[PDB]
Design a protein around this ligand. Sequence first.
Ligand SMILES: C[C@H]1CCC[C@H](Cc2cc3cc(O)cc(O)c3c(=O)o2)C1
Ligand SMILES: C[C@H]1CCC[C@H](Cc2cc3cc(O)cc(O)c3c(=O)o2)C1
Ligand SMILES: N[C@@H](CCCC[NH3+])C(=O)O
Ligand SMILES: N[C@@H](CCCC[NH3+])C(=O)O
Lengths: 499, 500
Amino acid sequence: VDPRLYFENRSKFIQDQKDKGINPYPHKFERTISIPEFIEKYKDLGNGEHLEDTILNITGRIMRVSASGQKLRFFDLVGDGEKIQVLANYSFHNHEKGNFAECYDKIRRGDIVGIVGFPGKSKKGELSIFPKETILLSACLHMLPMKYGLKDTEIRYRQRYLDLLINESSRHTFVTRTKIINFLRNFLNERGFFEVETPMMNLIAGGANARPFITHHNDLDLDLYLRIATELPLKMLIVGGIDKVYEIGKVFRNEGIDNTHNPEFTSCEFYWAYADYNDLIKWSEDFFSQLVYHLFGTYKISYNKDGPENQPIEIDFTPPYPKVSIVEEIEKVTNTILEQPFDSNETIEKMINIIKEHKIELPPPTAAKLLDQLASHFIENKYNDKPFFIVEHPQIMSPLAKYHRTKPGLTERLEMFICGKEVLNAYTELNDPFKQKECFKLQQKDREKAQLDSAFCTSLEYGLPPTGGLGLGIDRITMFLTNKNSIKDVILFPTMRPA
Amino acid sequence: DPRLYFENRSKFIQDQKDKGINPYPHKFERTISIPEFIEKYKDLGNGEHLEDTILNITGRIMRVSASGQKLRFFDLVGDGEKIQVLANYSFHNHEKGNFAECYDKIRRGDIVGIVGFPGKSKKGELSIFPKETILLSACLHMLPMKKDTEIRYRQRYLDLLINESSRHTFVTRTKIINFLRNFLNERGFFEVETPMMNLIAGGANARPFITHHNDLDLDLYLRIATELPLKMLIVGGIDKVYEIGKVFRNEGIDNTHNPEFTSCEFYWAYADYNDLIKWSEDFFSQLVYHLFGTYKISYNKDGPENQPIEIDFTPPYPKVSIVEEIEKVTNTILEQPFDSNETIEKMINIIKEHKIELPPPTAAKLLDQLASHFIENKYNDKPFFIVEHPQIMSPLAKYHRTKPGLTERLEMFICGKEVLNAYTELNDPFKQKECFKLQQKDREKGDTEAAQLDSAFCTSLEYGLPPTGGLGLGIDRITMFLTNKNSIKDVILFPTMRPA
Ligand SMILES: C[C@H]1CCC[C@H](Cc2cc3cc(O)cc(O)c3c(=O)o2)C1
Ligand SMILES: C[C@H]1CCC[C@H](Cc2cc3cc(O)cc(O)c3c(=O)o2)C1
Ligand SMILES: N[C@@H](CCCC[NH3+])C(=O)O
Ligand SMILES: N[C@@H](CCCC[NH3+])C(=O)O
């Protein structure tokens, strides 16, 4: 029909109710029971049975309107993701409260109502509330979309409340997200880790390699950068003696947006004094295996990697997972030998040309950037049926990772991928301040062609114990455990191009 | 000379490297933590050694002393607990190096790993008796003694290492958030995350922070509150929803203001103002007893140099209507409309006559100034509610069902400081835009802290927001009163500060 005319008529209805003295937005309706609790109490009720002496006050949203004549009105009432039917029969209406037809003729799809009624099942077995009075609590002034109208449109992301009301799978996705975070918090808390809050506005944005957001505090007259990671202050806390410390919160990176990149996303980083790379590998295998089984009762799950049209693949989270050394694998699959140093002009041009030969995009072509593109194009999709680790990244890729205790030029680093998407980053922590500043200076010369924080370097000088730290991408993990191809689908309000 | 001392320790590190020793080993497997060590061998007779039991233990050295050529003593601390180290020349593994040369290297602050056996000293001190002591990470600076300055805020790791009280404060902070989360979760509430970057910063009266996303060429405001997206979730059918996280306000800094701080907002469909007062009394009373085993706490409102006072969180708490109480204390009549030039001019004259500082003197700012100077310190021995704020002051609160011009709003104070804000939510879409249109009139007068209108929020209300009660908590300020702190800086690990 005409949505605009429909909204204007509903707006006039609201005003006309006010002119007649009715308040269409009452202050308080005292509910006796919720819709889920009502399904629970009366599901085992007789086919056709009534409990007319049990009077209840319930609320919900009308999501379907139908009629069987003037004296039998049928509705769908939804709440907390669950639904019952409303059977309004003239025979049971409390005529002292008003005229039957004038009450229910007013109801529209979407209206929030409060119902005083009694429980029963229809002749057909359909669990129902039988009102004796229905009261409008909050009207829906627009036409609700069809499920079809939300299918391939971004109304889901710009009007998420419509998606939550119309699509049952939407509520389930975000319930799983909270369950994932709850399980991660308990998993760490049971292991003695201490949750903290580190600043989101900082003089320097470090702990990763990404362009930051900038903002300004007026009263201090200070430019501040939003955190791109929580890594650096969490290590300062380890120096402070919080030997098991973690944080779950937002980080911000001023980068490209796509199906795996939201400018603000949720990370968890934990730091574990006296642990090393081996402890972090075992932690990763323990956590993901127990999380998947906590949620699905099994280690195998299906994931529509190629969209809902193509058939799904199966991801087996049974430990252990394979470990692939980045340099050795690139060397193996390319039939090249990457001599050290990796940032020598010899190895750079060697990586540049094997980039050019395989028709890949040359990144600023730094040795770190080239190695990333090589692993991205030759390793990261090695496994799709199972998560897997890429390990032992070179030092020039890992300015904060401790040097490999036996393999020169490499670090004790790990990255876990699921279907070619990084969800985990961990390594033995670099705690030698002299080796740390040398890593900071090389990035600055790489900059001239993240910033070094003197406060972090100073804290290393008071003694950082041997430590292992780990970071998780919560949204990306939720994607795979909710069968979603876009990060927009697991964030309630994702960052959108403005309308 | 600390600069000389750091220079010597740095040279020691390099010379240790030149000789053949790694001063920062990769891995040492700890057998037992220091808390487990105390808890397991507290039941030891004075002077007994369990020399058959060989343990690997780690910690930070915090004191170094010596008796002769063959005995050396240390404090080893970890996880806020401390044990003694008795390095005796009798038990030293000489195959690893010279006894004196091994322990001469150790300085206060060094992280070490110890292989040794448990025992108590002759005096009764629980101790680890090393057979080998390995340097794991040196402290290259002199560690100060028990740091009572700005150092605590810029070098929090030092404050955590040296001051026992610092660790307990932040432990209590995390305990408070844990209790809050469990409290809401067992009541059926659903935790969510909403955007911290937005086209508009609504939900409160505060100046925002602005930032810019390069690839989209789009200015974005940091959220000043979580009200608006959360209520949109109520529209979406999440009838019990909440969020615990950071918000950002571009304001002045003081003992109760950090530019970023932690808030909890929860929204509860089919509840109202009265359910919210009930929740506040239940939550605060149970929280205080959870932490303390009593509803009464001590707080040094006037600093440690002055006598403390008792705060009784036993419910119920007093309720004070703002306009009526101001009118009573001020002996004037504040007529509606409160934003009329007449009522504004009188409130200004009340502030001038009383030698209080005039605020942009908007009606809402004037009322709040009058409440702060005449109402909010009425009760210090107990928390209390200021209630029934005018429409002008609360553009998102539902109008009072019996009192014209007021709303069904409450804010709870402790020792004059706001820690809670709550009200029956305005859910009439046509009243909300009127409230939005009115606050832009105040924004035209220079009110940088006037809430902007979110058309996406107004649209969501047109799809039907059920009757709802919402509530906000200032987590940091609550932590202050429950850890006996007079500054918000003392309950945030790294408060906002200028560069060194
Ligand atoms: C903290 C990290 C630990 C494990 C690796 C992932 C990597 C990652 C990067 C990223 C960058 C964006 O600009 C936007 C995003 O959404 C993401 C994301 O989701 O994940 C997170
Ligand atoms: C979400 C609110 C609900 C309950 C009332 C407090 C008020 C409050 C405001 C504030 C403003 C700042 O600019 C810095 C801060 O630190 C704070 C703070 O701590 O508390 C929070
Ligand atoms: N800060 C890292 C995560 C932790 C890495 C191990 N310290 C990142 O942004 O990916
Ligand atoms: N947004 C409010 C807290 C919630 C008030 C009740 N909806 C504030 O910043 O104070």
